Coordinates of C-alpha atoms and ligand atoms in Angstrom, one line a residue:
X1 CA -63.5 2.4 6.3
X2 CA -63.3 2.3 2.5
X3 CA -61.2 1.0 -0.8
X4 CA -57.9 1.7 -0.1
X5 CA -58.2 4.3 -2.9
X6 CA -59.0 6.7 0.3
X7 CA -56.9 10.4 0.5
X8 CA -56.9 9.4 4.5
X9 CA -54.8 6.9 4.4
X10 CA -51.7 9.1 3.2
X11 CA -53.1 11.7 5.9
X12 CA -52.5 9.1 8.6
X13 CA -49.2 7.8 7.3
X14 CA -47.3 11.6 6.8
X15 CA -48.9 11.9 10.3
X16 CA -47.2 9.4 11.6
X17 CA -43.8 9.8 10.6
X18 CA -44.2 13.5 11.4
X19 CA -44.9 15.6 8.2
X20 CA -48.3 16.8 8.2
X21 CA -48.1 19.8 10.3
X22 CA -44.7 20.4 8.8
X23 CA -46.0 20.6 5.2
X24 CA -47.2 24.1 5.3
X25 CA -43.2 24.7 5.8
X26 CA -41.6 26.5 3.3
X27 CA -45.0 26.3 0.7
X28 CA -43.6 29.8 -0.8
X29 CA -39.9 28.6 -1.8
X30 CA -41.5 25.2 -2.5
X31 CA -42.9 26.6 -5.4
X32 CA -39.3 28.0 -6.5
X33 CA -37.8 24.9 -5.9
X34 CA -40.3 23.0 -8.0
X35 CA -40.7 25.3 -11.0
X36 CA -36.6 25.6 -10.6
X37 CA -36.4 21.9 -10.7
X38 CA -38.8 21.2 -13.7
X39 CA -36.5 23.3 -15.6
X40 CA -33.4 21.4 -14.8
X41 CA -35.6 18.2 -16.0
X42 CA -36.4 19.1 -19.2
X43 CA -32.8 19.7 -19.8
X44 CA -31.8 16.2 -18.9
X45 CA -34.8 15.1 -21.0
X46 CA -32.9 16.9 -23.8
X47 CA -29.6 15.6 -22.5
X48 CA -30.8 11.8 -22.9
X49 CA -32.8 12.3 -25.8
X50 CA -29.3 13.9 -27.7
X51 CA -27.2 10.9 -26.2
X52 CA -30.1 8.3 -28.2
X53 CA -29.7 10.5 -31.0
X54 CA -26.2 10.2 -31.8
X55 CA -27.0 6.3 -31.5
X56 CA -29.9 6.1 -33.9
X57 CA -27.7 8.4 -36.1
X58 CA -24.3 7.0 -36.4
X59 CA -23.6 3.9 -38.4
X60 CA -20.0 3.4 -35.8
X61 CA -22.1 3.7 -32.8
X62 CA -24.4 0.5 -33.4
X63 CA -22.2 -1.2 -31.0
X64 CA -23.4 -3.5 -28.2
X65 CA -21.9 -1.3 -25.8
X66 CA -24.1 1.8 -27.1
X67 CA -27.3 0.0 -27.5
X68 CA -26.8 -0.3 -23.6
X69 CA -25.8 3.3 -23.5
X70 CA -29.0 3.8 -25.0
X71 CA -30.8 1.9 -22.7
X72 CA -29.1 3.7 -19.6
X73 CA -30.1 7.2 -21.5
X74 CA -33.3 5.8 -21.4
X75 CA -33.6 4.7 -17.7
X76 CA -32.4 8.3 -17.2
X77 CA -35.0 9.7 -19.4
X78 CA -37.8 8.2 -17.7
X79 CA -36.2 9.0 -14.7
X80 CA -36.6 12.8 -15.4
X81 CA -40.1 12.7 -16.6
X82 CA -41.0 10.5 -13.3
X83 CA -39.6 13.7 -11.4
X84 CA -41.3 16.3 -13.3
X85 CA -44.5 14.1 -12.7
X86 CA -43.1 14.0 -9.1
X87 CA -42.5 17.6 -8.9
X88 CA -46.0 18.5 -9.7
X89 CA -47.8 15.2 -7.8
X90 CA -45.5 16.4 -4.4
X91 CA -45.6 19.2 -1.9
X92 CA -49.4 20.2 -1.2
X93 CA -50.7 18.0 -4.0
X94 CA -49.4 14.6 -1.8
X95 CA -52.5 14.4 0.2
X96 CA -54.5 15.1 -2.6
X97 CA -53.5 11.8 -4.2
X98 CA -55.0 8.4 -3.6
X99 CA -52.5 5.5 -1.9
X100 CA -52.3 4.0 -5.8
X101 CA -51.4 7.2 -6.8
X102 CA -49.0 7.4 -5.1
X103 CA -47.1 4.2 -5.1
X104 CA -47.5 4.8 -8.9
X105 CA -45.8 8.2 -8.1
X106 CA -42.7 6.8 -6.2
X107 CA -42.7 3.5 -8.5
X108 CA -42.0 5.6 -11.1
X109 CA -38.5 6.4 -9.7
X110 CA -37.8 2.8 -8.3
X111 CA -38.3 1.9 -11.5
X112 CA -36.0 4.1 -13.3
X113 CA -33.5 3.4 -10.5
X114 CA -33.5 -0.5 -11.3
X115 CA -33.3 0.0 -14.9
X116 CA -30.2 3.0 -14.8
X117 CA -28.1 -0.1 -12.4
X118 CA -29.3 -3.2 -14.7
X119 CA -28.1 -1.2 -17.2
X120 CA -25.0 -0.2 -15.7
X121 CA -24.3 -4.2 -15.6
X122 CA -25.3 -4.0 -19.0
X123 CA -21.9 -2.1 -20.0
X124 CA -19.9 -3.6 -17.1
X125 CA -19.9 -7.5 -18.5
X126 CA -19.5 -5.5 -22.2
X127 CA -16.2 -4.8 -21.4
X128 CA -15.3 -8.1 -20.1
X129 CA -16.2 -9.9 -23.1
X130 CA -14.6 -7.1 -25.7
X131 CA -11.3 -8.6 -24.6
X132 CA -11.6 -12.1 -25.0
X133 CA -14.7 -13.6 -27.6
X134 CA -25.8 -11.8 -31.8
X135 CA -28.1 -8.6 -32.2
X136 CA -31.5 -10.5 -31.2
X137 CA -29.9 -11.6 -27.6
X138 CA -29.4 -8.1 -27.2
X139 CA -32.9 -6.9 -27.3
X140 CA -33.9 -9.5 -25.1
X141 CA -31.5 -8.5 -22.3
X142 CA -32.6 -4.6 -22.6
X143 CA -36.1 -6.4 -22.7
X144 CA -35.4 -8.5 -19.7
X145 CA -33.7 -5.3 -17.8
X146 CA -37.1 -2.9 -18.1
X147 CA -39.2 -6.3 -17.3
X148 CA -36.9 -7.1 -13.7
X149 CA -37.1 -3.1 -13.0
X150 CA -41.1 -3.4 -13.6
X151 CA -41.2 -6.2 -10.7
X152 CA -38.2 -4.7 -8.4
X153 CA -40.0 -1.6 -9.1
X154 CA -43.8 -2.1 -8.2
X155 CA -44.2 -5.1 -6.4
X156 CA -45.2 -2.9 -3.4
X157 CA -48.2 -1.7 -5.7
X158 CA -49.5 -5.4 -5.5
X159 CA -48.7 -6.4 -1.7
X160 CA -45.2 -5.3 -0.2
X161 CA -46.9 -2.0 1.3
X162 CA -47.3 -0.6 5.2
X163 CA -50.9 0.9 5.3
X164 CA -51.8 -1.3 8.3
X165 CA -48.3 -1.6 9.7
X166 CA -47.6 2.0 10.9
X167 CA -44.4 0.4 12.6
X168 CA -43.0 -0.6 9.9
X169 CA -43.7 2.5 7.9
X170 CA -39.6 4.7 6.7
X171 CA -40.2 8.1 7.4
X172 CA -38.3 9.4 4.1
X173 CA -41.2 7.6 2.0
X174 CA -44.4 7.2 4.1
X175 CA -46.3 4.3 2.7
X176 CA -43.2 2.4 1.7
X177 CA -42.6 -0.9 4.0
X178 CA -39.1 -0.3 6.0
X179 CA -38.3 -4.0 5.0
X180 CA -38.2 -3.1 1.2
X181 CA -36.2 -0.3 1.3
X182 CA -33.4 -2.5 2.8
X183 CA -33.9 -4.9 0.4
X184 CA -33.8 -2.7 -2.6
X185 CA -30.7 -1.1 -0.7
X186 CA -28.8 -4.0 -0.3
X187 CA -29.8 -5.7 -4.0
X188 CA -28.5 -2.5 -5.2
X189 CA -25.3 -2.0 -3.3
X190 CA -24.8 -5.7 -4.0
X191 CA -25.1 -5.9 -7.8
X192 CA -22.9 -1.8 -7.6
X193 CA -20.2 -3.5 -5.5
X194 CA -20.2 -6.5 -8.4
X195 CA -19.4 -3.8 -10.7
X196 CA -16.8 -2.2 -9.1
X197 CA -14.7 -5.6 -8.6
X198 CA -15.4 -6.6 -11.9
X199 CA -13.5 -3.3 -13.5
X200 CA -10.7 -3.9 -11.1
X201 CA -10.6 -7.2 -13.0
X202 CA -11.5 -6.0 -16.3
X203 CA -8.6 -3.0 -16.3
X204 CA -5.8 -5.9 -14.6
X205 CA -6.7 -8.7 -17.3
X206 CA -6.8 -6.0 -20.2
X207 CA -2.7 -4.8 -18.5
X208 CA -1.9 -8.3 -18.9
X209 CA -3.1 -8.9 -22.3
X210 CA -2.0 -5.5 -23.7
X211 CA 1.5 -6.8 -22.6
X212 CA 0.7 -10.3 -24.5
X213 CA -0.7 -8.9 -27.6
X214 CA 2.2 -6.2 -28.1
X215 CA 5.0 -9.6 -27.8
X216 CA 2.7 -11.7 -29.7
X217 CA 3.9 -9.6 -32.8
X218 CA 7.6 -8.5 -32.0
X219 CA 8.8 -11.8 -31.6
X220 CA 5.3 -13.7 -32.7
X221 CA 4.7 -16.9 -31.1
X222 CA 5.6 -21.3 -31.1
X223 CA 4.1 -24.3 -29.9
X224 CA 7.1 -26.0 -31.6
X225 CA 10.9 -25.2 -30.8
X226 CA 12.9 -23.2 -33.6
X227 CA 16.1 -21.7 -34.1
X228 CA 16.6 -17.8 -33.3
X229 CA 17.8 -15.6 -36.3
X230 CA 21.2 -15.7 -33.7
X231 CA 21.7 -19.5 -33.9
X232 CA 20.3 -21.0 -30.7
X233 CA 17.0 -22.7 -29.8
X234 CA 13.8 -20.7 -28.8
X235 CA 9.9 -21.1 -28.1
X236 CA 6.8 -19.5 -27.8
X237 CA 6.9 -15.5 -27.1
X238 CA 11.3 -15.4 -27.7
X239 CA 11.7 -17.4 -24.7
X240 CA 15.5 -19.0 -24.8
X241 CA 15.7 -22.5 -24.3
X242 CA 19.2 -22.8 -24.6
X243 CA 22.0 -21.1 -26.5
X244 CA 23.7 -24.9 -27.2
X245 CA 22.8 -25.8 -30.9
X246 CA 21.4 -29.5 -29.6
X247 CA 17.7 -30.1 -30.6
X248 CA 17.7 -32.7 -27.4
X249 CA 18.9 -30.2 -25.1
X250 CA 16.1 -27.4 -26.0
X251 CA 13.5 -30.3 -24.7
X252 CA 15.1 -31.1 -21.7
X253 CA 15.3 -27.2 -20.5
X254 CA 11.4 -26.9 -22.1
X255 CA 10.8 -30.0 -20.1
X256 CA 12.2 -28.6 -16.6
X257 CA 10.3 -25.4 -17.5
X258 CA 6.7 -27.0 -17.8
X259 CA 7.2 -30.4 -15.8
X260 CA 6.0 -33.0 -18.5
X261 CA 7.4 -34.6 -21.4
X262 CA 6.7 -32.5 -24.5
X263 CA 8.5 -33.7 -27.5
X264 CA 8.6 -30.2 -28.9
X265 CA 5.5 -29.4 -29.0
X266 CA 3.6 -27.1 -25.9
X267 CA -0.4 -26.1 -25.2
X268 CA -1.4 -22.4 -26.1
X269 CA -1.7 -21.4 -22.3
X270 CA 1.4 -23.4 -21.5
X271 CA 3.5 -20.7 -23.6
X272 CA 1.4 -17.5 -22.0
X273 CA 2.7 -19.0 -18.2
X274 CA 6.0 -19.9 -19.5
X275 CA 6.0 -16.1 -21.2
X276 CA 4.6 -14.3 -17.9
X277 CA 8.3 -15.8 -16.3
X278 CA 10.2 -14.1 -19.2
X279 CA 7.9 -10.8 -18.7
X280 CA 8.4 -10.9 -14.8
X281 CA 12.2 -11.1 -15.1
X282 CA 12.7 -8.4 -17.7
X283 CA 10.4 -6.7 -14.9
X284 CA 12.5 -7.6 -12.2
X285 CA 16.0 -6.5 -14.4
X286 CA 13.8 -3.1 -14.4
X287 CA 13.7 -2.5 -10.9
X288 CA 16.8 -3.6 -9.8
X289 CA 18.5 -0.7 -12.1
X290 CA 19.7 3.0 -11.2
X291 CA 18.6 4.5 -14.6
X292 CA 15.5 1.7 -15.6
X293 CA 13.4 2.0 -12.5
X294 CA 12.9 6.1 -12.5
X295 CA 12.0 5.9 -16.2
X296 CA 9.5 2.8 -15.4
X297 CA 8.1 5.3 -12.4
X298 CA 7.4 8.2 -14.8
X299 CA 6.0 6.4 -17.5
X300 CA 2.0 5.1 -18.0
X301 CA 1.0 1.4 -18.2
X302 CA 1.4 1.8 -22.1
X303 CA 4.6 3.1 -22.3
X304 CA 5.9 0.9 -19.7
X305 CA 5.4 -2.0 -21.3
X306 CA 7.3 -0.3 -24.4
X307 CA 9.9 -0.7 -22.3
X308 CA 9.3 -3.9 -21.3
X309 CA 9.4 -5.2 -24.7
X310 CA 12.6 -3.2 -25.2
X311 CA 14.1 -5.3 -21.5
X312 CA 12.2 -8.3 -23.6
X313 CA 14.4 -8.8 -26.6
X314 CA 18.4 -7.4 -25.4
X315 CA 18.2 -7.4 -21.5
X316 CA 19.5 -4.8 -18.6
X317 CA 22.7 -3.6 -19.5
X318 CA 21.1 -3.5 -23.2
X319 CA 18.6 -1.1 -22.6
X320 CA 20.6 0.6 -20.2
X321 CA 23.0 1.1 -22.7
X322 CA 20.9 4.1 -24.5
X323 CA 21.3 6.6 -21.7
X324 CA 20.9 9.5 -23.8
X325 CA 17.3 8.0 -25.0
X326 CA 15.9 7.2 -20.9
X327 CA 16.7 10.6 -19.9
X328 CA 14.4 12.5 -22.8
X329 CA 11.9 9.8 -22.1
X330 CA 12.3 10.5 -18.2
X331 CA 12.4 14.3 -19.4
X332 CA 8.7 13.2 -21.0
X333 CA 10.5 14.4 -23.9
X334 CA 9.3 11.4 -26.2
X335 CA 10.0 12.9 -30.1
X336 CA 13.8 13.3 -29.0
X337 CA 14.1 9.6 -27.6
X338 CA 12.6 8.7 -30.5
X339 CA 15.6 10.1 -33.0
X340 CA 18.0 8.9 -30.7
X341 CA 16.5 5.1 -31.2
X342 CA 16.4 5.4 -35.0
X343 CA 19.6 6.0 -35.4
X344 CA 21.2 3.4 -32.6
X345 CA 22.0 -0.5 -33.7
X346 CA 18.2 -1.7 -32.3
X347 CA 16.5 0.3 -35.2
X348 CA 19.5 -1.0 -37.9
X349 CA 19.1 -5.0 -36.8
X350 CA 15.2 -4.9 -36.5
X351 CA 13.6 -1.7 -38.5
X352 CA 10.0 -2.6 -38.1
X353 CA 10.0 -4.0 -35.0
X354 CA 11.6 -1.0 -32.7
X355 CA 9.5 1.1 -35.4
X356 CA 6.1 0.1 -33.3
X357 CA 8.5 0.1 -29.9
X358 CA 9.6 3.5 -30.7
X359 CA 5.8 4.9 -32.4
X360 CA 4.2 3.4 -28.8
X361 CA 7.0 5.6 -27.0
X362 CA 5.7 8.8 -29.3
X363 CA 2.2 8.0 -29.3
X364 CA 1.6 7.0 -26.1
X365 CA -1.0 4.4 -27.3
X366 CA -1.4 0.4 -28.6
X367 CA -2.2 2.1 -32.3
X368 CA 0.9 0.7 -33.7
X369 CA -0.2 -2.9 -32.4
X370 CA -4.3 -3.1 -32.2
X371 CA -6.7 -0.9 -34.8
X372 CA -9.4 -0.6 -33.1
X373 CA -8.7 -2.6 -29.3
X374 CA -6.4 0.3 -28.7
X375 CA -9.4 3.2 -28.9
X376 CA -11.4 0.6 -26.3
X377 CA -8.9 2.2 -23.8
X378 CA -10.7 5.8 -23.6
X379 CA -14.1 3.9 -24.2
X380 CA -13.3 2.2 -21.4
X381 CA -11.6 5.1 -18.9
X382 CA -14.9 7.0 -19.7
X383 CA -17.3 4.3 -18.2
X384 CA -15.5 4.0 -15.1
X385 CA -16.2 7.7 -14.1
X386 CA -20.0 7.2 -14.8
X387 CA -19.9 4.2 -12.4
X388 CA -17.8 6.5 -10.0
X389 CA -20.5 9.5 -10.4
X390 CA -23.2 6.9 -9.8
X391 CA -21.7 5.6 -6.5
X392 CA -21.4 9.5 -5.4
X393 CA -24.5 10.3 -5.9
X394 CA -26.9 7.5 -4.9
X395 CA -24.6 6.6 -1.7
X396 CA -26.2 9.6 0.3
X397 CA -29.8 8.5 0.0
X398 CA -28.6 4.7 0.2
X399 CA -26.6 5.3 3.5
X400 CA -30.2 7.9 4.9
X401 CA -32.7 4.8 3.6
X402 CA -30.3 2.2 5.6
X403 CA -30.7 4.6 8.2
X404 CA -34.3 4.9 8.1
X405 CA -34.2 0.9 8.3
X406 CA -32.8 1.3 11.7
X407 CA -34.4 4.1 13.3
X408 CA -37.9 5.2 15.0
X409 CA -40.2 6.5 14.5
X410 CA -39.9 10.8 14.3
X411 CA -36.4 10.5 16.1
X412 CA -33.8 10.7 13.7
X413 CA -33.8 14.6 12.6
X414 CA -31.5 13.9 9.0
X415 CA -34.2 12.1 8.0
X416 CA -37.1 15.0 8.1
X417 CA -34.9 17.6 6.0
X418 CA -33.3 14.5 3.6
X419 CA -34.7 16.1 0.8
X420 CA -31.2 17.1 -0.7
X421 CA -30.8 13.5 -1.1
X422 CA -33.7 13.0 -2.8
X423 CA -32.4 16.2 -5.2
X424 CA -28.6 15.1 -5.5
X425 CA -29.9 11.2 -7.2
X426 CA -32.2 13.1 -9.6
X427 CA -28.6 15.4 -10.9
X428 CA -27.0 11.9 -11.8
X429 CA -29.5 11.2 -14.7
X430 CA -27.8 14.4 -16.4
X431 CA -24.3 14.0 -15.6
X432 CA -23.5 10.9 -18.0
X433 CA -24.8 12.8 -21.4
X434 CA -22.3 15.9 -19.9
X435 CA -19.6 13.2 -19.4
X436 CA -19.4 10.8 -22.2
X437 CA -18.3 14.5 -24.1
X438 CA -15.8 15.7 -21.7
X439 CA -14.1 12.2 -20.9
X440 CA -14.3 10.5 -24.7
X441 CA -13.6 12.5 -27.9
X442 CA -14.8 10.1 -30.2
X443 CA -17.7 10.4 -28.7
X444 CA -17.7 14.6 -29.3
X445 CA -16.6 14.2 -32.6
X446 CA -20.2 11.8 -33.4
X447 CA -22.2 14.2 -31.1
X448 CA -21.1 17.9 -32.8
X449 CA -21.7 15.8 -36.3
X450 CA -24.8 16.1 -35.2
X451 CA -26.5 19.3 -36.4
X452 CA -29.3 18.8 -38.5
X453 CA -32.4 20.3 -37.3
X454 CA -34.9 17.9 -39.0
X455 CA -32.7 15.1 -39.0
Ligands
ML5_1 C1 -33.7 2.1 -2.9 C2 -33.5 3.4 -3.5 C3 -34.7 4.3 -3.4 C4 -35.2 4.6 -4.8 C5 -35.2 6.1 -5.1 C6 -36.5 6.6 -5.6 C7 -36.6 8.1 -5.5 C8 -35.8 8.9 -6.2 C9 -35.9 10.3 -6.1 C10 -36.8 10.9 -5.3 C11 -37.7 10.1 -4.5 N1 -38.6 10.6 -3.6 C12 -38.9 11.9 -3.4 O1 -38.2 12.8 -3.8 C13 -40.1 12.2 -2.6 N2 -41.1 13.1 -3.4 C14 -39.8 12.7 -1.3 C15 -40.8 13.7 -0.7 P1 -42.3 12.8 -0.2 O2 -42.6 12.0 -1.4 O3 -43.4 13.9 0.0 O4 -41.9 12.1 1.0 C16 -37.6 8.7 -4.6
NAG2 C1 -53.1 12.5 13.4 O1 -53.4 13.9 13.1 C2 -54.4 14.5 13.9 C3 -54.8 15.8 13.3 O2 -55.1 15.6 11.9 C4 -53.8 14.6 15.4 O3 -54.8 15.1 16.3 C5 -53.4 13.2 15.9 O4 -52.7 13.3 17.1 C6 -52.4 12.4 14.9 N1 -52.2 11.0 15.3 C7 -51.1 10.5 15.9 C8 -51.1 9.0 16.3 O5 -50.1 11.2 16.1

């Protein structure tokens, strides 16, 4: 009996769950896993430390999106100087800490657990409001994200422990209560799985509104009917009312179309659901053709709607009336189509409008529409895959900890030698500083323009 500050308490706990005679197991290639390990930490200490670097050093990169960046290369700094700490506080030296010592030790990763998926949020809602629209909010959030990881982190410090409660004591982490693990399990795989349907949403929305922004230029946009350069009446995003040259009969097929009396004049979304009929047609005149359905199954999501724009403006037969252009562009041949378009009738009637058709063809990117929405696509791309490393590599130990939630006491044998686990969630903190260069060259370009040794 004494403070629970006592070395025997952590005796009794790893005695318990069956890993006090088992700890002089391995004590020789402990010390070369250790010593091994500290190595890789200090290189994602570097790592992290280059990724807030190229932050604090280019003016282009203070963005919202990197100050969260940031913040995650922080939560992943942290993370790897709680493991080196860990390194050197586990093994042999376990039972020569104190119970605060240790759920400081352990706290230390929970911490930079809560504060790596916070931040993941962070750049998840980022891209949600990029699309469709302030520096002092920001530092309240990143703020707010270490102060929630803080509480999420070491509340068991101050009260949500098992010292007297053997039975409810996980195996994998001795003096944590089974009950919190499950709840930091499930808050985590809950707030993940919120991110993973949001960029469903995010990456649908953006397919639609690439599509919108691309026709919102070629053939611009009404609330009021007008005449066509051919001689018949139109509205909103080139959507035919009529080819009769009666102003009355334009409002009675408008009328039909939205199912109210207009007058002329129709609501901003009214011409965006009206427009989605005109897109899902030329869509349907796609897939319903011999030589327009192949190309539209070997193009990408860019230059598919290229052709959609194309189906937009003349129709079926129109389109399929440049057979010598769909086969190079089925041929992924895109600088031959290209001539072959230049020459044709299309680029003669409307030069600077198949011009951006044509470039987005070449290209194979919104460049000739959006200046600087169109490089949000790779920035974009490149977050996804950290999400999808993140979900790879914490899964393990999340799937072993629910497990350890529903199992007694030294009987399930995955949880003795989970230790690989442990080892494969400590990796991830150096794998999104290796993959913002390999997945986004803007990115590179910022990080190689990075050599100065002083700087
Ligand atoms: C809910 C998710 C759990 C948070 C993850 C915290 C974490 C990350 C990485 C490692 C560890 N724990 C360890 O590796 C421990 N040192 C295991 C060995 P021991 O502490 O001796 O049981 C704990
Ligand atoms: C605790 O460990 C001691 C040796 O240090 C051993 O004799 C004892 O059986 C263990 N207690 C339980 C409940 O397994």
């Amino acid at each position: 009996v004494s403070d629970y500050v006592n070395y025997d308490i952590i005796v009794r706990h790893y005695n318990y769950t069956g890993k006090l005679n088992i700890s002089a197991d391995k004590e020789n290639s402990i010390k070369l896993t250790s010593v091994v390990f500290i190595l890789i930490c200090c290189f994602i200490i570097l790592e992290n430390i280059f990724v807030l670097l190229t932050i604090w050093k280019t003016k282009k990169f203070h963005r919202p999106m990197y100050y969260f960046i940031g913040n995650l290369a922080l939560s992943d700094l942290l993370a790897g100087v709680a493991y080196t700490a860990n390194l050197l506080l586990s093994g042999a030296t376990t039972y020569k800490l104190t119970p605060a010592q240790w759920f400081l030790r352990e706290g230390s990763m929970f911490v930079a657990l809560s504060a790596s998926v916070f931040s993941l949020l962070a750049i998840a809602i980022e891209r949600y409001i990029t699309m469709l629209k302030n520096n002092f909010r920001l530092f309240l959030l990143i703020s707010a994200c270490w102060v929630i990881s803080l509480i999420l982190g070491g509340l068991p410090i101050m009260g949500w422990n098992c010292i007297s409660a053997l039975s409810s004591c996980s195996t994998v982490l001795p003096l944590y209560h089974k009950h919190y693990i499950l709840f930091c399990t499930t808050v985590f795989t809950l707030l993940l799985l919120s991110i993973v349907i949001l960029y469903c949403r995010i990456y649908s929305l953006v397919r639609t509104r690439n599509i919108f922004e691309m026709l919102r230029i070629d053939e611009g946009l009404r609330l009021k009917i007008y005449k066509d350069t051919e001689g018949y009446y139109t509205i909103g995003i080139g959507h035919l009312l009529t080819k009769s040259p009666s102003l009355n009969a334009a409002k009675s097929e408008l009328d039909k179309a939205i199912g109210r009396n207009t007058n002329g004049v129709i609501t901003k979304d009214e011409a965006e659901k009206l427009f989605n009929q005109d897109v899902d047609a030329a869509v349907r005149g796609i897939l319903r053709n011999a030589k327009l359905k192949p190309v539209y199954d070997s193009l990408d999501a860019v230059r598919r709607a290229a052709l959609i724009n194309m189906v937009f403006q003349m129709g079926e037969t129109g389109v399929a009336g440049f057979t010598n252009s769909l086969r190079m562009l089925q041929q992924k041949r895109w600088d031959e189509a290209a001539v072959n378009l230049a020459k044709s009738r299309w680029y003669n009637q409307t030069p600077n409008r198949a011009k951006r058709v044509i470039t987005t063809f070449r290209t194979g990117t919104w460049d000739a529409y959006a200046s600087r929405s169109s490089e949000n696509v790779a920035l974009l791309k490149t977050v996804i895959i950290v999400l999808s490393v993140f979900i790879a590599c914490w899964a393990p130990l999340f799937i072993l900890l629910l497990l350890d939630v529903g199992c007694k006491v030294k009987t399930c044998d995955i949880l003795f030698r989970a230790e690989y686990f442990l080892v494969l969630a400590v990796l991830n903190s150096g794998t999104n500083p290796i993959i913002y260069t390999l997945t986004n060259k803007e990115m590179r370009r910022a990080f190689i323009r990075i050599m100065g040794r002083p700087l």
